[PDB]
Amino acid sequence: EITGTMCRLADQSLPPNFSSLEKFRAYVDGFEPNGCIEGKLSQMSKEVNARIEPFLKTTPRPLRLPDGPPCSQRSKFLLMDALKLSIEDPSHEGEGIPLYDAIKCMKTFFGWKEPNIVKPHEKGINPNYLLAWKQVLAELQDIENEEKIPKTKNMRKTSQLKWALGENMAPEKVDFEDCKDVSDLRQYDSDEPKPRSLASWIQSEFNKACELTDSSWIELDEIGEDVAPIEHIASMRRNYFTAEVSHCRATEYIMKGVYINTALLNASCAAMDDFQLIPMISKCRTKEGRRKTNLYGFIIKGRSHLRNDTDVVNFVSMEFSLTDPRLEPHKWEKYCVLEIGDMLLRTAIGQVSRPMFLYVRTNGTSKIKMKWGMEMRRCLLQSLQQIESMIEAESSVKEKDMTKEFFENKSETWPIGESPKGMEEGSIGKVCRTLLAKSVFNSLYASPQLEGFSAESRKLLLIVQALRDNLEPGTFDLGGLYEAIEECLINDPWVLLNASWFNSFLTHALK
Amino acid sequence: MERIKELRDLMSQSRTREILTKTTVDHMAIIKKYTSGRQEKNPALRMKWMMAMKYPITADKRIMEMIPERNEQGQTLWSKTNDAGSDRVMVSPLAVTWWNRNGPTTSTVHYPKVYKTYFEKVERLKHGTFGPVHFRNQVKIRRRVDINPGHADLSAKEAQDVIMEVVFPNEVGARILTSESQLTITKEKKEELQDCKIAPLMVAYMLERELVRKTRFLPVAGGTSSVYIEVLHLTQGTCWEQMYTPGGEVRNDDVDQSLIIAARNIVRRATVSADPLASLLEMCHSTQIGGIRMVDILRQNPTEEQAVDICKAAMGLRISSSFSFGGFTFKRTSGSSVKKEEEVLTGNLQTLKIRVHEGYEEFTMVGRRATAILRKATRRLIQLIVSGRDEQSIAEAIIVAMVFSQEDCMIKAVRGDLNFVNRANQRLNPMHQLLRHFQKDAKVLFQNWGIEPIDNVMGMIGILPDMTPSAEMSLRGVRVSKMGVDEYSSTERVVVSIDRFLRVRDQQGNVLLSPEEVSETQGTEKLTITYSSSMMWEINGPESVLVNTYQWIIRNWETVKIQWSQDPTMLYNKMEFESFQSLVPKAARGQYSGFVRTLFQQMRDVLGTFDTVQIIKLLPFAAAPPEQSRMQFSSLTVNVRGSGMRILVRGNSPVFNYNKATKRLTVLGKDAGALTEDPDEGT
Amino acid sequence: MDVNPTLLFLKVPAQNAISTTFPYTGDPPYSHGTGTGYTMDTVNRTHQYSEKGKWTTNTETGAPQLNPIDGPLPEDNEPSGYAQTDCVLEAMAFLEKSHPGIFENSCLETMEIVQQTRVDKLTQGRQTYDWTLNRNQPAATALANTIEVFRSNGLTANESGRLIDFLKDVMESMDKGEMEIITHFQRKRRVRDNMTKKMVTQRTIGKKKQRLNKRSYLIRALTLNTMTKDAERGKLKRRAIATPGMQIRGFVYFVETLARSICEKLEQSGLPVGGNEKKAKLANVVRKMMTNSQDTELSFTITGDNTKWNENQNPRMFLAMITYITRNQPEWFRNVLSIAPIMFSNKMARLGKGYMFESKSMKLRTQIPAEMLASIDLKYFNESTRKKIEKIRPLLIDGTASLSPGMMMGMFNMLSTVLGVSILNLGQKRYTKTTYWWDGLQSSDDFALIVNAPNHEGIQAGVDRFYRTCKLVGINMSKKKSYINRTGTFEFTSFFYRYGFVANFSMELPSFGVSGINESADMSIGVTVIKNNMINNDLGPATAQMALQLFIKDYRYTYRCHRGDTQIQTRRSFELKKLWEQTRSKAGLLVSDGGPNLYNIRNLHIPEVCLKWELMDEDYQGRLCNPLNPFVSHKEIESVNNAVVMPAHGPAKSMEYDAVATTHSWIPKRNRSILNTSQRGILEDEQMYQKCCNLFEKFFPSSSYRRPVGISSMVEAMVSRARIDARIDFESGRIKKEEFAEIMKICSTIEELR
RNA sequence: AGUAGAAACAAGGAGUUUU
RNA sequence: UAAACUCCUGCUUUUGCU
């Protein structure tokens, strides 16, 4: 039975003019459909409709990118412009420890200079960064002269390093009733992000992440013996895959981003108070098979007390570069470029020397950002699963051995390039890298703006394929779909590039 | 004994242990999962986070007794703090390092008997054999298929009932004890636990795991058996299938049921095919059932099935001496009769020329659904003791009995004409026409039969025209038994003869089995039925039949073009285009093949209409035997499921769509291959 | 040259390479601060699309709730929850006329699931909202706190193990005004030391009484906690997910029991199962629409989606459905299904945490609770949030917000789907009586529709007839995110469809790796995920021995257990080589302690140690055959071979995995932030009890396999067994019958302690 | 500063001592 | 009162007490 509290609120739980449930319970039993559907469509408005406009090939307007300043570098290390301070073949004196692998690299770099700021940090205290590098350049030499043999290295808290690592810049949690009358006690800045625009550089990051290299970047585990025919046909399919994924520069960024986020996550777990030092190491096997240990630069971890899932670990990234910041300064708004050295290069005609920089930058990851850099090796899966599935669309075509079909002709049939000479088709080995270089940058620059873009940029992608396949498509208000995308193109360089590809796609899918 | 003291020793402490006095049946039933610490929303980060702590693992307090805190290396391998929420302490993974190199070594040789099902899989795989890749497309079927049911096919609660006995018997609470088959199998399992070791309770609920019949919907492109279901990914795929024969005992009960369903996909393939007398022999040499071919299984099999015995007698092997009629097993226990060729006028005054059996004969009617004894006279049913599982099975058994007795009451009960002309060029027989009519509706037949009073003595009750039992009165001659009909008969094998029409004739010429006697039930396979030709395309689906046929023309076009030019009859008698002809209109039977063979003969004489569009488009039609027709043969109707979706004579269609610029063929949507540019170029 | 990869759709069709446009590789978006701004932007949005129903005021609640259905018809394309009761009943009076006898059949199993279910069915699931502590307690502790509220109340009436008397007294709990709940607060003591002569402090927890009202319990009984939908993908914004209360899900379990039982008897809801049956149902009806495929029809499909699907429902027409789909059913059964659409139609969402304020002068932060929002100097807020409070400041009751229109996430599905498919039932041609007719499927909110009619004018007249049918019931299809085209190309919860052959690419691969539950049992579930997704989620052969190859590469990074043949160093390398040189079975040693990787794609279904068993020399597996196992803590059947790994199709899914008990299946560390709360007393009292509850559960054998359901009084419960332990040892045994008298003596000695 | 994006982090939390 | 040192915690830090 429904008692004298719930049965009374069993009356407001009804449609209006039904003031008793037991009357309403004895209303539906005497129900039969009179035909009140079209009786209500006679009563509804004729304006409530879902009229289809046709979706012609002159219908899709291109996406309008936002307008503002050019977009800054936001990846938590450098991408196209790091520098491989390399000791080659570590057997002895290059050991398994990363911090002693650091010391031998710049001992093998001969030309060092005095630190002078090339471009200043436009809104941060510039001499704190040049005193930061002078600390660690003296602090990493505080272990190669002293044989007490440490494993990791702790910075000590200066005045310049407390600044760039957010030391006690947090407002302390007062009670609200302690100081109500503060004239500017506001709710936080909950505003929109200030929009940026598309600059020329994030395209040039993607071109370099597409192209090959002379190193072999992934060496990975083994599996059991292929004494089945599926395991012989898949391992021939897979050792064709890593013939262009070992030598691809976007796997330099995977095996960095795995390593930086691994070392940050482990050093955040032990050293929750002091400022550790972390080098940035990638180990590159070569063409022939002699190994190498590259160094890219250092990282000074901040205070890491991660009480939520997305509290931020501040840190400072020192990276060795060769690219002049004065060449294109619409990119490095967040950096403080020093100038530390010089080397000799080898020209095909002669030889040349040219200086060396150091890009210093205050950063931050959450725990989530530096977990999802450790599963960045799943860029390889998502980039393999298409050329896996690009055997399914070629399954019914040939009905035979067909890994023997792709990599054995250079029948460059897949359109990738844009050029003055048109679109430039590519081979599958070129395509296996672009789908990898797209899949890396979906994790380095991964924002919410990329999620909410490609959800309703897919629904604009599907119907242009329905239009090219002459399926006679039709929307309901496509114009309102375009203000669902351009809502999400706000300020990060990758999403403003994906739309800029997509506008370059809609002008090639409709000719 | 000694456990009970500490059950008392805690009590003279404070009221901490004396709220456990107050803790209910329910509260301990709920606090057994009492988690102050919630379930991890993202455990993948917590494992990557806590493994960098110096002590991630909680191991219980016995580690402080049995494992040193000092190893040879220099690390400290457990910690003296307690876990939050237990007396359990926190350890490092160097504890697990220590235990697996320096821990106690116990030699229980019956630890494989604990996890016996997993070692069966290794036994299936290491002793299994692979076949080569059959590059065929995936047309997967997504069905709820069983995973590892195991022994006796026992209910999921009843699986826990026999486990509840063998863990400790005093907690069973089973209102239903057991059946007789469970009474022996639990006695064997009873001593096996002492045979394991002094054993935990975990050996009990792994024996529970091999009894759980899990049924999980999975896309099964191939066989669906609890020996093939655990692989399911090794075998099936994109461009390809992997033939896979795992080791172990190939069973005895339902390799029959594996063979029956594979047989019917060759007989029904043959009835559309132009030559059942050659193709069913020819498809025996390519079909494999679990690697073991159909040629090897049929010989050692004394199981009588209609399509199987056709596959037996095609190869030169015997069948039994039991004649069939409407797909039932009929055994002559007594009596004899002679044939007499007589014509009867039905209720629609339709002449049916029937073979009158002049002589009293006593039969045993055994069906898939019924078991009966028919006492039959000249054009008359004397007596029918009949049994079956339900009254609809009794409905089938009486209707088959009322037709075969050939009485004038059944003949004058026909309402309308009979044109069950089956899918074929030939015709049929008046016996099988009279079955289907009254198997559709026999209510008027039930009233014209005759109703008589009965005597119920030993549970021998009757049946009424409204298909209801009655102890008072009943239909004439038919008595329905409450018990089962005693059969116990065995039949010797006799060499029998067969024709092209699959009409199985004995020494005397009596037609025993036929494609009309083939039952229409299409069962669920068990052993992967793998055909080496193209006769899996109908199993795939009517849609696929149309797709994969125009696929096959493309790759082998240079085989086809020479067979187009030189020998079209060899091109037409291919068994791969006979897959198409199951979908051909029967009203347009031979009409289409009439025109295409001439339209090709038009194209061979003109030498300049070598077009490559219509040659692809109409070549599957000429596999049928052609006929003379009037000039109206141009609405080319092609069956898909239900609707006869058309193809035009000129241009494209929704069914057959060809794009000249793309040079790709769109067949009911799907893109089929890519034809080479050469037969567009030449003439 | 300029390189873009999104131009490879110019050759590959879009549904064949659609997985490139799933950025599921990067992190998902998380909410940082609260859901307070997100809840109020849903209580606003519900009371905007329903803004014309009559505003009642609840008698026992004081809630100013809205009563929006069977109101004025919508007269624009903006979404609207004004559902028509004479068309909700009508459009599923046609549910039984297509599939005959669904409702009274499906109640009959539901009348049997109600007659065998314990309370233990509702103690499993997500974290819930208790009303005792006003916090997301997990599903055991919230149930096992509200029950001894009734015991600390006068009327328990619930301890009979079944949940229906537990669902009798939650109605009866709304009668007793004085609801004397338990409060514990933390204090300090003062003890001495005899060895060092020092006098230090000691922490302990006190006890406090507390009472409620009927305008204070009923709100907390009808309170939905509003979280934020963390890690949703495909939305720039976020949304509120609702956590139902403790009393509510007891009634809601029966309501989705019935409503799932409908959809398994229907054939257009792919939701009551996983994704593989959904691909069957999807490709079923593209062929079911080629049944009446005539010589000239036109069949356009609709790749639908429903916008604002959760705000535009109303549990008042859920009550209209489950009053109708329980026609001529017993009085108690129609009543017990009816409480849950009642106490959703009076539900009162909390407003989450609040807001964090910032001083730009004093450099101070603070945060208010969400309850203070009834009384705040409104210039504390920026111009966006200030708009959101003023539109629901009339709706704040007791720190909650009266939200009677609309459902929201994490609360209940599968009955609004029954509604959503019943409109799709109505397009069956026997019901249209016109040339156009439609069918399709209905997921949670993403639907797909296929309509056909002999020309474009018919389809245009068939699409809007559907759209104006769904408007009668508050189903508002997304005009943004949907489109039409011919058959063979659509999607349905991202199950894309290209001319017949689906590419799944939904719940792509958030995991493929070490989802650490244990050290072995995340390899046994590790290689199971590569196994199961070769079947379910369709990854091919080479990516299966890539996702295995790399699975091990971070199986060995989290658990540090590299080979000895790699001379690299970590916390141990040396004594591994003791296993290497001594065991003649070098290449059969187990990989959770530095072994080879014998796995490949012939043998994922085989577990780890049963793979590496017919090679090992007797020492190692004999060192693994020790059943003592300080690293196992032999689990319960609900937790034996169960890991909770989330897909993108549902909120949670447990999937099993063939894991042999081994020394690597250990339980990870409990979080320790509860030690610094003022809620310490929920642990130090109860940490002692599963030390000793499982000392009882030694004395029953089946207690660690089956739920023991008998009398109360655990202390009295084993001594009833102990005296039937006594006589069957007395009548026959190996032990002496004088030691029997020692077993006798303990029994009354227990009772001598009162 | 920085991370970040519609609200957050920039340690929280307990003790003692000195205008 | 401003400075330093002392212990716990890293999903439970979302909030009920004295």
TrEMBL record, chain A:
<dbReference type="GO" id="GO:0004519">
    <property type="term" value="F:endonuclease activity"/>
</dbReference>
<dbReference type="GO" id="GO:0003723">
    <property type="term" value="F:RNA binding"/>
</dbReference>
<keyword id="KW-1190">Host gene expression shutoff by virus</keyword>
<keyword id="KW-0255">Endonuclease</keyword>
<dbReference type="GO" id="GO:0075523">
    <property type="term" value="P:viral translational frameshifting"/>
</dbReference>
<comment type="subunit">
    <text>Influenza RNA polymerase is composed of three subunits: PB1, PB2 and PA. Interacts (via C-terminus) with PB1 (via N-terminus).</text>
</comment>
<dbReference type="GO" id="GO:0030430">
    <property type="term" value="C:host cell cytoplasm"/>
</dbReference>
<keyword id="KW-0597">Phosphoprotein</keyword>
<dbReference type="GO" id="GO:0039694">
    <property type="term" value="P:viral RNA genome replication"/>
</dbReference>
<dbReference type="GO" id="GO:0042025">
    <property type="term" value="C:host cell nucleus"/>
</dbReference>
<comment type="function">
    <text>Plays an essential role in viral RNA transcription and replication by forming the heterotrimeric polymerase complex together with PB1 and PB2 subunits. The complex transcribes viral mRNAs by using a unique mechanism called cap-snatching. It consists in the hijacking and cleavage of host capped pre-mRNAs. These short capped RNAs are then used as primers for viral mRNAs. The PB2 subunit is responsible for the binding of the 5' cap of cellular pre-mRNAs which are subsequently cleaved after 10-13 nucleotides by the PA subunit that carries the endonuclease activity.</text>
</comment>
<keyword id="KW-1157">Cap snatching</keyword>
<comment type="similarity">
    <text>Belongs to the influenza viruses PA family.</text>
</comment>
<keyword id="KW-0464">Manganese</keyword>
<dbReference type="GO" id="GO:0039523">
    <property type="term" value="P:symbiont-mediated suppression of host mRNA transcription via inhibition of RNA polymerase II activity"/>
</dbReference>
From TrEMBL, chain B:
<comment type="function">
    <text>Plays an essential role in transcription initiation and cap-stealing mechanism, in which cellular capped pre-mRNAs are used to generate primers for viral transcription. Recognizes and binds the 7-methylguanosine-containing cap of the target pre-RNA which is subsequently cleaved after 10-13 nucleotides by the viral protein PA. Plays a role in the initiation of the viral genome replication and modulates the activity of the ribonucleoprotein (RNP) complex.</text>
</comment>
<dbReference type="GO" id="GO:0039523">
    <property type="term" value="P:symbiont-mediated suppression of host mRNA transcription via inhibition of RNA polymerase II activity"/>
</dbReference>
<keyword id="KW-0506">mRNA capping</keyword>
<dbReference type="GO" id="GO:0006370">
    <property type="term" value="P:7-methylguanosine mRNA capping"/>
</dbReference>
<dbReference type="GO" id="GO:0003723">
    <property type="term" value="F:RNA binding"/>
</dbReference>
<dbReference type="Pfam" id="PF20950">
    <property type="entry name" value="Flu_PB2_4th"/>
</dbReference>
<dbReference type="GO" id="GO:0033650">
    <property type="term" value="C:host cell mitochondrion"/>
</dbReference>
<protein>
    <recommendedName>
        <fullName>Polymerase basic protein 2</fullName>
    </recommendedName>
</protein>
<dbReference type="GO" id="GO:0042025">
    <property type="term" value="C:host cell nucleus"/>
</dbReference>
<dbReference type="Pfam" id="PF20947">
    <property type="entry name" value="Flu_PB2_1st"/>
</dbReference>
<keyword id="KW-1048">Host nucleus</keyword>
<keyword id="KW-0946">Virion</keyword>
<dbReference type="InterPro" id="IPR037258">
    <property type="entry name" value="PDB2_C"/>
</dbReference>
<dbReference type="Pfam" id="PF20948">
    <property type="entry name" value="Flu_PB2_2nd"/>
</dbReference>
<keyword id="KW-1104">Inhibition of host RNA polymerase II by virus</keyword>
UniProtKB/TrEMBL annotation, chain C:
<feature type="region of interest" description="Disordered">
    <location>
        <begin position="50"/>
        <end position="82"/>
    </location>
</feature>
<comment type="subunit">
    <text>Influenza RNA polymerase is composed of three subunits: PB1, PB2 and PA. Interacts (via N-terminus) with PA (via C-terminus). Interacts (via C-terminus) with PB2 (via N-terminus); this interaction is essential for transcription initiation.</text>
</comment>
<keyword id="KW-1191">Eukaryotic host transcription shutoff by virus</keyword>
<feature type="domain" description="RdRp catalytic">
    <location>
        <begin position="286"/>
        <end position="483"/>
    </location>
</feature>
<keyword id="KW-0945">Host-virus interaction</keyword>
<dbReference type="GO" id="GO:0006351">
    <property type="term" value="P:DNA-templated transcription"/>
</dbReference>
<keyword id="KW-0808">Transferase</keyword>
<keyword id="KW-0693">Viral RNA replication</keyword>
<keyword id="KW-0548">Nucleotidyltransferase</keyword>
<dbReference type="GO" id="GO:0039523">
    <property type="term" value="P:symbiont-mediated suppression of host mRNA transcription via inhibition of RNA polymerase II activity"/>
</dbReference>
<keyword id="KW-1195">Viral transcription</keyword>
<dbReference type="GO" id="GO:0039694">
    <property type="term" value="P:viral RNA genome replication"/>
</dbReference>
<feature type="short sequence motif" description="Nuclear localization signal">
    <location>
        <begin position="187"/>
        <end position="195"/>
    </location>
</feature>
<comment type="function">
    <text>RNA-dependent RNA polymerase which is responsible for replication and transcription of virus RNA segments. The transcription of viral mRNAs occurs by a unique mechanism called cap-snatching. 5' methylated caps of cellular mRNAs are cleaved after 10-13 nucleotides by PA. In turn, these short capped RNAs are used as primers by PB1 for transcription of viral mRNAs. During virus replication, PB1 initiates RNA synthesis and copies vRNA into complementary RNA (cRNA) which in turn serves as a template for the production of more vRNAs.</text>
</comment>
<keyword id="KW-0547">Nucleotide-binding</keyword>
